[PDB]
Amino acid sequence: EVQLAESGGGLTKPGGSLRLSCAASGFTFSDFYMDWVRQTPGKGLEWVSRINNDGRNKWYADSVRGRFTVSRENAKNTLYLQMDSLRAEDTAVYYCARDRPVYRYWSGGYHLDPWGQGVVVTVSSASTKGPSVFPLAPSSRSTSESTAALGCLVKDYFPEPVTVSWNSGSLTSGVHTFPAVLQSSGLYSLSSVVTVPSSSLGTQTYVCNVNHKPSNTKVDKRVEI
């Protein structure tokens, strides 16, 4: 029930501005310090900012001070990160996390727990581009091989991320969604596959649901033989 729900990711040009949101529920938000933490494949986890429970006191990492500002609206249970003068190097997944609790007569320990789900911030002069989705279909061949594979190729999009589900998240067993690969064109591609019994092709329908929030696109592709 303790939840942190992040929003506001996406693509911006270098020098631009973006505003992240972190909506809290399941606890008294005004009782806790909060933090922002970011993550890249290169530098790992990097703490970004901290704010105390009433929003009076704020702290920043050296790398973002003077460009990012943290704030909160306790009446709306919402934490914010205002990112100005964005740099190529600010590209990362951004998380919010709950920190120190404050009591009537003292304050508790320091924490990062729980964390929000994460939003991707990409800083780039390249333009958004939605994905081309193509079915990955078997053929009528492997009758006596009992399991069949099928999937969706999610091709030539930018930026990250796309999320792929199958049959609206009802089909999860055997699903493998691969990490995206950056192409020489500067666009991304990935596949999502799943294995099902051969006693299903023509018996039931399989649709991959591709969400690409940055371009504002949701694609559904039924995969057939």
Added chain:
Amino acid sequence: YVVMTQSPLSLPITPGQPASISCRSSQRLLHSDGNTYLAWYQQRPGQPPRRLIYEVSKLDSGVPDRFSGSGAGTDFTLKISRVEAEDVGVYYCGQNTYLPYSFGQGSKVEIKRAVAAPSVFIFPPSEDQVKSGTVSVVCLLNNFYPREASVKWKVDGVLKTGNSQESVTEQDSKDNTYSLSSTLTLSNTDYQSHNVYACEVTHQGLSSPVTKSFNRG
């Protein structure tokens, strides 16, 4: 800045065995208030870090009892009593005694299981793709162990280099296997140039190479 260093960045592990991860800080982590604010987190692909241990040895609510933490000063260790399938992932230590908060580089746990040969599948391009610019042929290697695997593309019986890319999942949490995709991307005209497309797979679990193929059309 307090630097946090972990070891060993990778750990192969037999199920049911115990495992230990170390974390060293460049500065004592005792806080003015008497606590030592060193935490341990577990991260799975596509998810935020999940805290397991806080204040060196306190277990978070709902954390399996086989996780434990120890240490003091500048030396700390996470321990698993008996590793289970779901313990694969990347583990981080972090400190909250000093700003800026800082984290170790991460230690990836991999769980050795019984060798499993890949199920191989080849997917001919959907008719849709041809009338784009490029055409993508996908070869799938499903649910194998260990991770090392070799994929060769053959076009009309001739090896093809330089137009394929691989992508690999992380070790699965439930069955502890990997999967891999190899995608061959050709121009529209080139894909027309040839008739037969095959991917040949080599793996320790395969007594001979496995080849999957299709005829264009």
